[PDB]
Design a protein around this ligand. Structure first.
Ligand SMILES: C[n+]1cn([C@@H]2O[C@H](COP(=O)(O)OP(=O)(O)O)[C@@H](O)[C@H]2O)c2nc(N)[nH]c(=O)c21
Length: 178
Protein backbone atom coordinates (compact mmCIF):
# COMPACT_ATOMS: atom_id res chain seq x y z
CA UNK A 1 0.00 0.00 0.00
CA UNK A 2 1.37 3.43 -0.97
CA UNK A 3 0.50 6.04 1.63
CA UNK A 4 -0.54 9.56 0.72
CA UNK A 5 1.07 12.41 2.56
CA UNK A 6 -2.28 13.43 3.96
CA UNK A 7 -5.44 11.59 4.94
CA UNK A 8 -8.31 12.84 2.77
CA UNK A 9 -12.05 12.91 3.17
CA UNK A 10 -14.67 12.85 0.39
CA UNK A 11 -17.84 14.75 1.34
CA UNK A 12 -21.15 14.90 -0.49
CA UNK A 13 -23.51 17.91 -0.37
CA UNK A 14 -27.16 17.35 -1.18
CA UNK A 15 -29.27 20.17 -2.61
CA UNK A 16 -32.16 19.77 -0.16
CA UNK A 17 -33.45 23.23 0.70
CA UNK A 18 -35.61 21.65 3.45
CA UNK A 19 -32.45 21.04 5.55
CA UNK A 20 -29.97 23.82 6.53
CA UNK A 21 -26.87 23.97 4.37
CA UNK A 22 -24.71 22.33 7.01
CA UNK A 23 -27.00 19.34 7.50
CA UNK A 24 -26.85 18.60 3.77
CA UNK A 25 -23.11 17.81 4.03
CA UNK A 26 -22.34 14.15 4.51
CA UNK A 27 -19.10 12.29 4.85
CA UNK A 28 -18.69 9.48 2.32
CA UNK A 29 -15.27 8.03 3.03
CA UNK A 30 -11.71 8.86 4.08
CA UNK A 31 -8.46 7.44 2.58
CA UNK A 32 -4.75 7.97 3.18
CA UNK A 33 -3.58 5.51 0.55
CA UNK A 34 -3.19 5.64 -3.26
CA UNK A 35 -5.04 2.33 -3.54
CA UNK A 36 -7.82 3.53 -1.29
CA UNK A 37 -8.11 6.70 -3.37
CA UNK A 38 -8.56 4.66 -6.55
CA UNK A 39 -10.81 2.16 -4.77
CA UNK A 40 -12.92 5.15 -3.74
CA UNK A 41 -12.74 6.95 -7.09
CA UNK A 42 -13.46 3.87 -9.22
CA UNK A 43 -16.62 2.99 -7.27
CA UNK A 44 -18.43 6.25 -6.65
CA UNK A 45 -20.45 8.46 -9.00
CA UNK A 46 -18.73 10.96 -11.24
CA UNK A 47 -19.50 14.54 -10.37
CA UNK A 48 -21.41 14.71 -13.68
CA UNK A 49 -23.86 12.03 -12.51
CA UNK A 50 -24.71 14.12 -9.46
CA UNK A 51 -28.01 15.88 -9.20
CA UNK A 52 -28.18 19.63 -9.83
CA UNK A 53 -27.20 21.43 -6.65
CA UNK A 54 -24.89 18.72 -5.34
CA UNK A 55 -21.24 19.05 -4.52
CA UNK A 56 -18.45 16.57 -3.89
CA UNK A 57 -15.70 17.97 -1.67
CA UNK A 58 -12.32 16.53 -0.93
CA UNK A 59 -10.79 18.01 2.22
CA UNK A 60 -7.93 17.21 4.53
CA UNK A 61 -9.14 14.92 7.29
CA UNK A 62 -10.32 17.17 10.18
CA UNK A 63 -11.32 20.06 7.98
CA UNK A 64 -15.02 20.21 7.21
CA UNK A 65 -15.68 21.60 3.70
CA UNK A 66 -17.50 24.66 5.00
CA UNK A 67 -16.48 28.25 5.64
CA UNK A 68 -17.07 27.64 9.34
CA UNK A 69 -14.14 25.31 9.88
CA UNK A 70 -11.28 27.13 11.53
CA UNK A 71 -9.10 26.09 8.67
CA UNK A 72 -11.46 27.66 6.14
CA UNK A 73 -12.67 30.74 8.06
CA UNK A 74 -9.97 33.16 6.91
CA UNK A 75 -9.49 31.29 3.68
CA UNK A 76 -10.64 31.58 0.14
CA UNK A 77 -10.99 29.64 -3.06
CA UNK A 78 -9.51 29.43 -6.48
CA UNK A 79 -12.73 29.17 -8.48
CA UNK A 80 -12.87 27.51 -11.81
CA UNK A 81 -16.09 28.17 -13.60
CA UNK A 82 -17.14 25.65 -16.20
CA UNK A 83 -19.37 26.37 -19.17
CA UNK A 84 -22.56 24.29 -18.87
CA UNK A 85 -22.24 22.62 -22.30
CA UNK A 86 -18.60 21.71 -21.59
CA UNK A 87 -19.71 19.58 -18.58
CA UNK A 88 -19.27 16.32 -20.42
CA UNK A 89 -15.76 17.13 -21.70
CA UNK A 90 -14.34 19.09 -18.77
CA UNK A 91 -16.09 18.46 -15.43
CA UNK A 92 -14.94 15.01 -14.52
CA UNK A 93 -11.47 15.47 -15.99
CA UNK A 94 -10.98 18.74 -14.01
CA UNK A 95 -12.37 17.21 -10.84
CA UNK A 96 -10.09 14.19 -11.11
CA UNK A 97 -7.09 16.30 -12.00
CA UNK A 98 -7.89 18.47 -8.97
CA UNK A 99 -8.15 15.50 -6.60
CA UNK A 100 -4.82 14.38 -8.00
CA UNK A 101 -3.39 17.82 -7.34
CA UNK A 102 -4.54 17.74 -3.71
CA UNK A 103 -3.66 14.07 -3.13
CA UNK A 104 -0.31 14.40 -4.94
CA UNK A 105 0.64 17.47 -2.92
CA UNK A 106 1.34 19.40 -6.13
CA UNK A 107 1.45 22.63 -4.16
CA UNK A 108 4.74 21.71 -2.41
CA UNK A 109 5.98 24.29 0.10
CA UNK A 110 2.45 25.71 0.13
CA UNK A 111 0.75 22.39 0.73
CA UNK A 112 -0.35 23.48 4.16
CA UNK A 113 -2.38 26.36 2.80
CA UNK A 114 -4.56 23.90 0.87
CA UNK A 115 -7.70 22.77 2.67
CA UNK A 116 -9.41 20.77 -0.07
CA UNK A 117 -11.50 21.30 -3.15
CA UNK A 118 -15.20 21.42 -4.02
CA UNK A 119 -17.01 20.50 -7.20
CA UNK A 120 -20.41 22.13 -7.43
CA UNK A 121 -22.51 20.46 -10.04
CA UNK A 122 -24.98 23.15 -11.13
CA UNK A 123 -27.53 23.59 -13.89
CA UNK A 124 -26.23 27.14 -14.52
CA UNK A 125 -22.70 25.76 -14.91
CA UNK A 126 -20.31 23.73 -12.77
CA UNK A 127 -17.57 25.08 -10.59
CA UNK A 128 -14.53 23.46 -9.19
CA UNK A 129 -12.37 25.20 -6.66
CA UNK A 130 -9.50 24.67 -4.30
CA UNK A 131 -9.92 25.97 -0.79
CA UNK A 132 -6.89 27.51 0.85
CA UNK A 133 -6.57 28.52 4.50
CA UNK A 134 -5.63 32.24 4.47
CA UNK A 135 -6.80 34.59 1.72
CA UNK A 136 -4.17 37.02 3.05
CA UNK A 137 -1.25 34.71 2.12
CA UNK A 138 -0.76 36.12 -1.39
CA UNK A 139 2.31 34.05 -2.25
CA UNK A 140 0.60 30.80 -1.19
CA UNK A 141 -2.63 31.68 -2.95
CA UNK A 142 -0.84 32.83 -6.12
CA UNK A 143 1.39 29.74 -6.23
CA UNK A 144 -1.59 27.43 -5.78
CA UNK A 145 -3.40 29.46 -8.41
CA UNK A 146 -0.61 29.29 -10.99
CA UNK A 147 0.17 25.61 -10.38
CA UNK A 148 -3.51 24.70 -10.43
CA UNK A 149 -4.29 26.70 -13.50
CA UNK A 150 -1.43 25.16 -15.43
CA UNK A 151 -2.39 21.65 -14.28
CA UNK A 152 -5.94 21.79 -15.63
CA UNK A 153 -4.67 23.22 -18.91
CA UNK A 154 -7.10 26.15 -18.81
CA UNK A 155 -6.54 28.57 -21.75
CA UNK A 156 -3.55 30.65 -20.49
CA UNK A 157 -5.00 34.02 -21.54
CA UNK A 158 -8.18 33.48 -19.45
CA UNK A 159 -7.90 34.49 -15.80
CA UNK A 160 -9.32 32.59 -12.87
CA UNK A 161 -10.06 34.50 -9.69
CA UNK A 162 -9.56 33.62 -6.06
CA UNK A 163 -12.35 34.80 -3.76
CA UNK A 164 -12.12 34.99 -0.01
CA UNK A 165 -14.83 33.05 1.77
CA UNK A 166 -15.55 36.24 3.74
CA UNK A 167 -16.53 38.11 0.53
CA UNK A 168 -18.37 35.08 -0.86
CA UNK A 169 -20.56 35.10 2.29
CA UNK A 170 -21.31 38.83 1.94
CA UNK A 171 -21.66 39.51 -1.82
CA UNK A 172 -24.61 41.48 -3.19
CA UNK A 173 -15.32 39.50 -5.80
CA UNK A 174 -11.66 38.59 -6.64
CA UNK A 175 -8.73 38.95 -4.20
CA UNK A 176 -6.23 37.59 -6.68
CA UNK A 177 -6.28 36.58 -10.34
CA UNK A 178 -3.74 34.30 -12.05
C1 LIG B 1 -19.84 26.67 0.54
N1 LIG B 1 -21.08 27.15 1.14
C2 LIG B 1 -22.16 27.50 0.51
N2 LIG B 1 -23.07 27.88 1.42
C3 LIG B 1 -24.48 28.41 1.35
O1 LIG B 1 -24.88 27.88 0.06
C4 LIG B 1 -25.23 28.99 -0.82
C5 LIG B 1 -25.01 28.56 -2.23
O2 LIG B 1 -23.68 28.61 -2.67
P1 LIG B 1 -22.99 27.42 -3.57
O3 LIG B 1 -23.63 26.10 -3.30
O4 LIG B 1 -21.56 27.30 -3.18
O5 LIG B 1 -23.06 27.77 -5.16
P2 LIG B 1 -24.37 28.33 -5.94
O6 LIG B 1 -24.72 29.69 -5.46
O7 LIG B 1 -24.02 28.37 -7.38
O8 LIG B 1 -25.53 27.43 -5.75
C6 LIG B 1 -24.27 30.01 -0.29
O9 LIG B 1 -24.58 31.34 -0.78
C7 LIG B 1 -24.60 29.92 1.22
O10 LIG B 1 -25.94 30.39 1.52
C8 LIG B 1 -22.56 27.75 2.65
N3 LIG B 1 -23.23 28.03 3.80
C9 LIG B 1 -22.49 27.83 4.87
N4 LIG B 1 -23.02 28.07 6.04
N5 LIG B 1 -21.20 27.37 4.79
C10 LIG B 1 -20.50 27.06 3.63
O11 LIG B 1 -19.28 26.64 3.58
C11 LIG B 1 -21.22 27.27 2.61
Amino acid sequence: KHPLQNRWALWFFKNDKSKTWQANLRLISKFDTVEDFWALYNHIQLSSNLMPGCDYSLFKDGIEPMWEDEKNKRGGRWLITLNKQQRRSDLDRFWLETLLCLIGESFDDYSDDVCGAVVNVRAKGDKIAIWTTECENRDAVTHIGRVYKERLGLPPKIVIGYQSHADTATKSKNRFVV
